[PDB]
């Protein structure tokens, strides 16, 4: 279930990883931390700020054994086309994080962030620990992006607790 | 599941029409022939040929009182972004037909062309008469494009059969 | 599981056909390992049907050349098929046939393929391209009065092969 | 359908004098009807009996009796068999109605349909002016019946209703 | 069942054969053609002409390997009494065919010819082949006579088919 | 309404031979009179006639006490007439002073509980039915044994006496 | 029960030669049996018949036939009625068994029980050596039957077996 | 209503011998009086008469205190009268000052819960029923053993006193 | 319970010769038992019958018959009534067992319990050596029975086993 | 309506001994007063009188604060009276200043949750019930142990103090 | 069940013992008497008087093999902080008895003292013997405190019974 | 439901507001933004930092039309006692925000943050708009606190969207 202290719902799908298509799953992240976050749609004005900021600070998450993965109900083909749109035209440009396709909408559904009527995800974020346990979640309404720095601080606060 | 001689399932959604977002529905085509065709996904290499072929020959359909509407499970932002990608670059360029978004997937479901596992449409095509009745349908597997010329021919053939 | 739908296995069928002026029982199993075009038409001795059927018979060897058999089906008996065959083309008939004319006398084949109109008791003009593994790759259905392009059907059969190569 | 019971309803398209005409049991109210079935157009076992009924048709008409032949073939098949000359195994011109039972419901309702192959046994019904069955007989597929015997029976039922 | 191409319903009963009581059944006729026909009642005047005609023609049937059996719901004692009444007195006089009693009415019921209301048989006729398969059946309403010659023609016609 | 003593006699209707003619009769026709209703198995057999002939010879003796006699079997009324027209020398019934009722449908024997379903004929039952239609007496014999007619008359009188005193 | 069927089982206490004895249907295999019912001990309507069977009992024995009288009274009422002299309206000495049907089951299984008043009609059954009913007759309560006729029938049934 | 102390006595109706005459009597006949209703197995048995005779001899004492006594068995009323008409010296009942009630259908013995169905006779129950039909006392003996008439009478008087105070 | 049927089993605490003793129906096998019920200790209606039974206990014992009185009172109430002098409305010394039916199940199993007030009707049961009920009688609450008559019945039942 | 603090006391009604007489009492009679309702297992046992006597001796101290006291066991009211009439010297109650309620049907002990079903007597429960019939305090002791009367009066006082202040 | 004579319901949870957190459960008290009492809430003005009186007298319970445990639905962190509040300021100060936390409310529920609406316990007290059997219970409404001396007297009286009669 | 875009579930309970006990509910905040946040337990080392940070910055929320309410499963008496403990000793000190008591646990349950096992809330936070619609929620595991500046920035971002785009 998508609640804190419970194991994260299993997921699998096609992601853009480094300009390439790869099938990824929750299993691939065992033994690291994972920030899994959702955004409504590719090619919309409100999303990319948050997605880019995550890409920019990705190295910082890697440094503490934390992976980052952005998800939307769009196809992996739409993801790539948007990654190949340069930031100066409201694209994403190169990405340091995976762009998971939730084309079936099942991932968003499993994480309790899918809006069924229009068929797209709220802005959910989950911090998942090395055993697949959810330590933190937050959800924002569509117009509002989150602070990437606060996410990083939380990953660190969680690791600190584990270490002590 | 839709069938020749049966009324076409109702549909409504956001289309890109002449670079802009418009709400469209089956009712908007009463009094006219409609070609409604589905393709899998935006930004794939198997589809632009068919969609481009249809857009190029669109006025020929307009001349015989027939609209053309292309449909995929992509959002209408994906549609517009693909329209705003030059053909030389593998995009759609300017479109003379509507591109309807089936984001909820319910239109593909209703037309019986939704593949539920991957969550995208088979290449269905439906010719619907001025009364909403399906005169012709065909469906191809994902990789294979159809002939626009043959679709135009069938339309005129159904019109000939009125007289 | 078998259904007259693209990506699904074609429903089994068996019946009496006219094959080279002779009665032969044939079935879906006879066509395993090759492509099959199975198409339905409403009725023997109607003016709307022979153009399409003759066009397939005329192109039959081009279909065989790309590993594709062609089988026409109506709900008429095999005796009707044979009489229409033995009516020359100059006389409104089918004349010589290079394809199988399957009888669906019980109408069950049309039913299983989803093209039977029960009320009047005949098929719509459906066509199914079935691959060597028995999987439907393409289907199309016309209302009764309208013939289809045999050229286009041949091009599609070629294209499905091209794509699996 | 047994003797002393009312004839099942039927309706269908018939070839009547080279033309397509919708006929039904009700068209025969007030007249005798010989309704007989044969298995299939264009088979060699059937034409001898159908032609014999055609040849002797006015003799039935003379005693207020109509003759209708029925098979599960379409009316287009019936017409092609009429347009085949007798010398060529055809029916040639007909003085009796050839009824099409394409749906098979008529043969089903008259109790003569063989479901497995989907064709009718060689059944014959004598139906009085009120639509009551006075007589019935059935032969296996290969064997034709005596027309003069059927005429004799018609005349004998008429004799009995008069005396 | 009593339908063309089906096997004839099994029957058994006491018949009058050449002035004597003999129990007969459908199995007795294996290897032979059988003409099995029904009439309504003994000692009535409408039934007799048909029956005498089959009797006078019996040898023509025997010559083509065919038996003839007349059936009514009467007892076998009635059948004998009727056979023992000279024709000149309106009886059947001597018979060359079997007269089978259907006292229980079960034979006429099984052959689909019994009028339940008065409990007598319609005039039905069945030609049954050597395997017990019905090839022809006909049922006239109670008064109307039928043709021995035509029944003979039909028997021969079925045999012709069986041979060529 | 059952074939049992103290109960009303089951209704009956059928064609009888009366004075050599056909007439439909029924239980109703005997209201106000006593009736002897008796059953025998089959016309034109050698065991039934003594009883029937004996009831006929003694018939006026029953009439003298306001009592009718009706004989019943499952034979048709045509069989009944032919047997009456067969002389007694020849095993027939000869002239009859009593009605011979036909129970062709077997339903009268069934209603009177005398029908043997196996062979489809009546046991030798006898019922004495009062002027109210009430069964005062029944007996039933196995097929090969005949009844004393004089005992039946005495029983009728006995019942009348009891009523009268 | 009916003629040509096996007699229903019975068992009960009978007065036999002035002693109580348990008898049953099994005791009479090999012999004929005349089993008859009367309404009630000590009523003026019954003794005549019962007496007549007693007087004639030797004749029945001479033809291998037993006679048993049955009523729903107890065997003590039977004995008391036997010990009542004939002039005083009793039965006096008996040559036949007098079976008590206290439980009413015997009258019930023989079809002669009047349920309302709880007593038997006057039925008589002739039962053969195999326990099969050959004859039955039933009288309303006031009317006695003929013992000579009953004896005639037993003899006639014996003649039919022997020839 | 049930055969239980403090409950209303079950309803009964049947034919009794009353002063050598047949009379139909019922529980209602006894309203406003005390009623001793006792059962015994069978007429003409060696055991029973002592009890019954003892009750008859003492009957007037019961009357003096407004109490009726009714003996019941499953015998017919004809048996009862024959037993009455049999002198005491011979094992009979002789003259009777109490009613002898027949329960030929056995329903009275059933309603009073004293019938043995297997043998079809009553256990020896005795019920003291008050003027409003309420059971004040019951006793049941096995078949062979008789009852004290004197104690029954004391019990009637005891209840009468109590029900007044 | 009815005559000819086995007495229902019972067990409980009795006052026996001024002491508390558990007794059951099993204890009376091979003996006759008179089991009688009375409504309540310390009521003016019951002592006469109880005292009379006790006064005649030796006469019962001499014929191999035990006598047990039962009420729904506790055995403590029974003992207190025993220790109350006869002069004062007590029972005085008792030659019979006084059985307590505190749970009321004994009275219920013997069919004498008045459920409304929760006390027994005056039922009496003569039980033979195999525990078969030979006699029962029941009186309404105000009326006592004759001890003499009970004794006579016991001796009569014995006479019948003994002779006929 | 249940035996729990803050709920209304279950309704009761029964016959009590009150000043040497039998009176019908119920929960309703105590409306507008405080009520101490206590159970004990059995009359005439050595273990209960000390507690009952101590309540009786202090009864006027409860009266003075508008509080009634009633003892309850499953004994009849006739046992209760007889135990009152037994001197204290002989383990009796002697005279009582409190009501002794009879719970002969055991339903009161049941409704108050203190009935031991197996032996069919009450545990030593006590309930302080207020003028509106609401339970303020309950307590239960195993059979062998008596409670302090002073402590029950202190609690009654304490609940009254809380009501006023 | 929380009924006298029944085994006490099992409980487990975190208590403050001697200024420290310890898991305790019913099994810990095997061999010992246990007074388990409940109070509504930490930091309210009603409870501390009883809790403090129990702690002051704890040595008298310990001297007769008896533990005392106080329970409320508060967390063990509240308990500790109440202990760490001076008595001067309505705190508990030093405790000689354990303060059990019933944060899930399940213990007050299992002991029948949970008020579900507000989510806190009535003032129930249970004396549980060395085998885990409830010998005595009591329950007061929220505003009234019990006498500790009387609880100690009961523990002693139960031990007296165990050792003699 | 506690999901973004849905209406916040109704709540009502006792809060400490400026050192006094006050009943508050969701209705009280209509027309204002509300930050409703949950913490596990009063008097724990883990929570005060975040509670104190919200209180220290309360005036920044007030100035953008936003109230802040903290919630736990502790009673309001524990809340008040934690307020009256000095910060130097692990206390909350003076609070500028309301501390809501969730003693029944129903608020934590309705907001989907109650850990049923231990009976305390996870660290959930909800930003609720003036119409009662949830705009943002976050939940942390028990040991980790949130940034109060990030909560305030979100309140401002939602207000900004509402005012423009």
Which chains make the largest contact? Answer: J-K, 24 and 24 residues
* CATH topology heading of chain A: Glutaredoxin
Strand tally of chain A is 9
What is the oligomer described by this structure? homododecamer
CATH C-level class of chain A is: Alpha Beta
Tally of helical runs of chain A: 5
What is the C-alpha radius of gyration of chain A, as a whole number of Å?
15 Å
Helix and strand element order of chain A: EEEHHEHEHEEEEH
Percent helix of chain A: 25-40%
Indicate the CATH architecture of chain A. 3-Layer(aba) Sandwich
The largest sheet of chain A, given as strand count, sense and whether it forms a barrel, is: 7 strands, mixed
Number of domains of chain A: 1
Q: Which class best fits the helix and strand makeup of chain A?
A: alpha+beta
Judging from the principal axes of the Cα atoms, what is the shape of chain A? globular
Q: Report strand % of chain A.
A: 25-35%
CATH superfamily of chain A: Glutaredoxin
Biggest β-sheet: strands ordered side by side in the sheet of chain A: 2-1-5-4-3-8-9
Straight-line N-to-C gap of chain A: 27 Å
């Amino acid at each position: 279930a998508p609640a804190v202290t419970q194991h994260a719902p299993y997921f699998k799908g096609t992601a853009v990883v480094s300009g390439e298509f790869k099938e990824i799953s929750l299993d691939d992240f065992k033994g690291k931390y994972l920030v899994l976050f959702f955004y409504p749609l590719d090619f919309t004005f409100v999303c990319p700020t948050e997605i880019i900021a995550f890409s920019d600070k990705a190295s910082e998450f890697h440094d503490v054994n934390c992976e980052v993965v952005a998800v939307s109900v769009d196809s992996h083909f739409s993801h790539l086309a948007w990654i190949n749109t340069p930031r100066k035209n409201g694209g994403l440009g190169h990405m340091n994080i995976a762009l998971l396709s939730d084309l079936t909408k099942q991932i968003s559904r499993d994480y309790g962030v899918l809006l069924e009527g229009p068929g797209l995800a709220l802005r959910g974020l989950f911090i998942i620990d090395p055993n697949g346990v959810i330590k933190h979640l937050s959800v924002n309404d569509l117009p509002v992006g989150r602070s990437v720095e606060e996410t990083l601080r939380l990953v660190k606060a969680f690791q600190f607790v584990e270490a002590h």
